[model samples]
Target: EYSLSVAVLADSEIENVTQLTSVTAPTGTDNENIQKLLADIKSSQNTDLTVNQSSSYLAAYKSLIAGETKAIVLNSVFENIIELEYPDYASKIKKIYTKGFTKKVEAPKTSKNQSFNIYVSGIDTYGPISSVSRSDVNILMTVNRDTKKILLTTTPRDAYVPIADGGNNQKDKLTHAGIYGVDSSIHTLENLYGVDINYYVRLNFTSFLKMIDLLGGVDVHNDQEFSALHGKFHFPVGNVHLDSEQALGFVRERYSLADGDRDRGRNQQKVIVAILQKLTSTEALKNYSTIINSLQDSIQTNVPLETMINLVNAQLESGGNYKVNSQDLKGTGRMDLPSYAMPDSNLYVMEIDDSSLAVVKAAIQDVMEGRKLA
Candidate 1:
């Protein structure tokens, strides 16, 4: 089962607190999550509790520090808040408890020739894949076992979209949805495309580079000539071989291009295609154990271990080449007032074109239904 960790913080002076009578919340999102955690904790400890909601996180944290509340529940993502934001309160604020609950996720039925969609999220942070951060890479991978086809739909990080379950009911850049967690991003994409994402795979920049290096680098095709990192990395059109740093520059060099983020999205798709080629190549099979070991800690996924094994077995049994197709969501750019996720400054965001969204929706539907690929 996939899990989410919730932390219980308390004042260090408090000792042997058997019962948590009150908690705090600074926003609707925090309130909702606190309520859920309260219920779970109550069930496990067989005790009842009360809530002390506040207007802001600062007020709530202040109240706790002043001994007004016995304990407060927070998402584990905020574990370092005391150290980062209030160093003086660092010694006073102690994490007394932590609980991990199984996440509610739907897994697709498996067979030799089934079609499924998996959401791949590449968070910008380096620590835990589950940590709250902006998702730099969002790709929907549609796999058809019978046809041996893989369709990668790359969504621009700056695309403006409604954040599912985001408390303020505001539109945010697709990347910002990751700040709420992976589930929010999944729900947002599912709502936007009207498709059920069967599973999710999450990773960070460090893992991405490590994985590419483990695979002995990747050979990708470039459309134009460009130099990144002040000419430290150069790419010419056509086939190009990339190491870890070179590949990172390849996918992340958007400011140099006229299209900016949109071009980066397409480059991300190219990187995925290159990785897929490397994975399915004869060389990868011989070093399968090394590859798996390399990725063990670098990635997190809701896809079951057995299911992944079965899929790999099916691929091996088929003994056929998989056809890969790529698609990009097109949009116009504009600088807009900050979204609720980032309510402090103006930001560059993408205005999704309706016609392009319709095309993507239809393509996703066709792929999921096992219809002929266009």
Candidate 2:
């Protein structure tokens, strides 16, 4: 049996990864040195243990569903996975994982960076911006950063996993983490995937809207013409332009789509890729201020300014490339619960197939090496 792994390749090298500005104005014109101020603020920030006990991953998941806590500590790589799975409820809960943490090595890190997984959490459901909410979407993403490979796998919210709180060893859907917060969810994924998460990015509906707007909207392909309560959306099974509102409605609407969440994830990936493409495009580069201003409120992560600066520099100065690979855990062969409140308990079993797991393991190895996925 092949276990998931992470590795840093020998050929890969990171030249200059530094934090120059907390804000990288898209244009490369607004060169401000806010690093010192940021450092001072970081010094005063509270670094304390908010959660009480460290239990098994499944137990934590149960506690989250029990609604005992607000946030939990999670490894970061799974950030996208959670967002993809529970796009509706990831942001309300807070994540306080280790910040300013980087796995740097002269040769390519050690066994730890070789292969790892992350969880993505989405904080909102359908509606305008409300109070900070819980993570409804829970996904497991394995990345081989070094090899540039990625694997996206998801566990249904209703899947029967061991709930953490009250010692309820009985199986419950994986989404209870959103109810209690990150503490439970983080532990649960660690238990399920058997990998450690290093970093996490928490997303909200507002952030999703802002990111799409920053890209001037994203392009997506529609299988068939469909309309929802939000508005009328029609595409010719080809590339279509989408503004913030339209993009949000498109990605979030599963009822009208024939493929449901499976296709919804593909669309979400398209939007994200579009945003990434726009960020590196000449147009986005020319309008840096607008992009930074838009992100100020929407994006929230445990990532430090220094680490972000390093990534930005690598992407800009070095021949840094990024790739996104998506994997689906549930197919027609697997179970499918009804889409709504109170799902069919009998049909909610999580069955991980071999092909999907292979993809996930390979992706994890590539990301750790700092190479692009093939």
Candidate 3:
């Protein structure tokens, strides 16, 4: 009775044959390249659920419309979905999720050695690891090794901002940018917020849950109570220490908070802050490898292993004061679309007033300068 009709839409066969060729064989040097490629894809395929491996997003969309599937995962951008379907599809498409790397510690040209900004996107897509989905939670995490400071910024899901690449003039939610590509989302945020993003980390909801479990869960202060998915999920107010699954429910619930999206963003920040706090602790440091190994598949990032190692080394070496600051952008603007009648579209965007942006700029500067936000 608790069946979820998820239509897993991904490329395989002819379409995947080409993509796999590149991944499995860089220059086609190996003669058994095709065989190897097919084997890999077949092994990675999600056989546990109903999957449609055709080469079209529309096919998946049709599946959703025909009630053949309640959810789908495809490689197409989110903007295309909203543009094609407009109010109807946009409304129906309630959530988006993405999985990518945050920092590339292994890449030679990665920005891991310096103070840089990374985007942590929490994509709401579920079912199987290979399914592609849109991002729902978009967070910009700035780490300044020189200053030994960390800052986390949350951008609400409905914050209407300019599209990163080629798209209409009308604003779109920051999460939808992931539908296009990380580059599109990055460019759009950089242009909109006037902040340089050096790297990005993407985490799927499933992976987020897994990673939390890997770390033995996290602790946070829940300021409001809410329910979702037909009240099957409920979150109460007050301080609570949540395991991975509970944490997922906590971050995903927006209806329970009075400020709606803004409160939800704050709750997300609280979760991230808690995670950082836990990760930096001595107990977590001792078990870092075990934790990372357990959630490696759930994480995609530009962070290199070496850079991460270096940071870990720095954390280990440092005995000085460590500081972190969290902030969010809120406004009075509103966008009323027929889809869900969101009372406030002026939720969280980077291009706030100069006075407000000064706070964020100061947070970044403080971290880069080896000082705390005092």
In candidate 3, what are the lDDT values of residues 1-374, reduced to their tens digit? 01111222232122222222122111121123223333444466522222334223444555655656544543234335534444455445432222222321212234534577887877767755445455678888887766666788776665566766522323666666666556666777776667778777777878888877766789887666776545766666777888887788778777657987778788888888888877877777776777778767767776677767766767766845446677776544453432111222333333334566567666666665566575
Of the two candidates 2 and 3, the one with more favorable TM-score, higher being better, is 3
Query: What are the lDDT scores of the predictions, listed in order?
Result: 0.72, 0.49, 0.58
Error of 3 at 7 (Å): 21
Mind sharing the TM-score for model 3? 0.64
Q: In model 2, how large is the Cα lDDT of residue 102?
A: 35
Cα lDDT for residue 360, model 3? 66
Candidate 2 structure quality by residue, lDDT tens digits, 172-266: 45665554345456666655555666555556777777787667787766666765445665545667888887887776776667876676666
Model 2 Cα RMSD, Å?
A: 17.0
TM-score of each: 0.78, 0.56, 0.64
Top candidate on TM-score is: 1
Model 1, span 1-374: residue lDDT tens: 22223223432554422445656665455666666666776787775666667654445566677767656655544433233346465455665545565555444434334788899999887775555567879999998876677888988888888877542447878887776577778888988888878888889888898989988899988998888777789999999999999998888888887677677878888899889888877657555667777797878778877786666665566667778888888888888645554454588888889999999988877776778755
